[PDB]
Design a protein around this ligand. Structure first.
Ligand SMILES: [Cl-]
Lengths: 65, 62
């Protein structure tokens, strides 16, 4: 089917973007960190989105609530 | 927090927790070939960041 749609987050003075793409090796998630005039990103292949999500729950559960 | 790692194909992801005067942050580095990039996420948005990522995990198929 079509890919999930673009998403955005704002924190402090920077913006985060999430977009989905696909090539011959497959589907991936690009997470960009964009500031007024700086830009860097990471690229996560689909086959490890779950592994990623789990690491995050682990960090979120272990927060000083 | 502890700090973790993960391998996929030709890439390594590292998860490090750091701290400055303003508070705690999580830095996610990507290393492939011999290049590395990273994004850094302050604690105050870990939940929102988790949910957004989780929503993407909810859309996936087979
Ligand atoms: Cl998908």
């Amino acid at each position: 089917g079509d890919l999930p749609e673009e998403r955005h987050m704002k924190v402090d003075n920077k913006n985060f973007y999430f977009d989905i793409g696909q090539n011959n090796r497959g589907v991936y998630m690009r997470i960009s960190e964009v500031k007024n005039n700086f830009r860097t990103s990471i690229t996560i292949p689909e086959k490890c989105w779950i592994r990623f999500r789990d690491i995050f729950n682990d960090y979120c559960e272990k927060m000083k609530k």
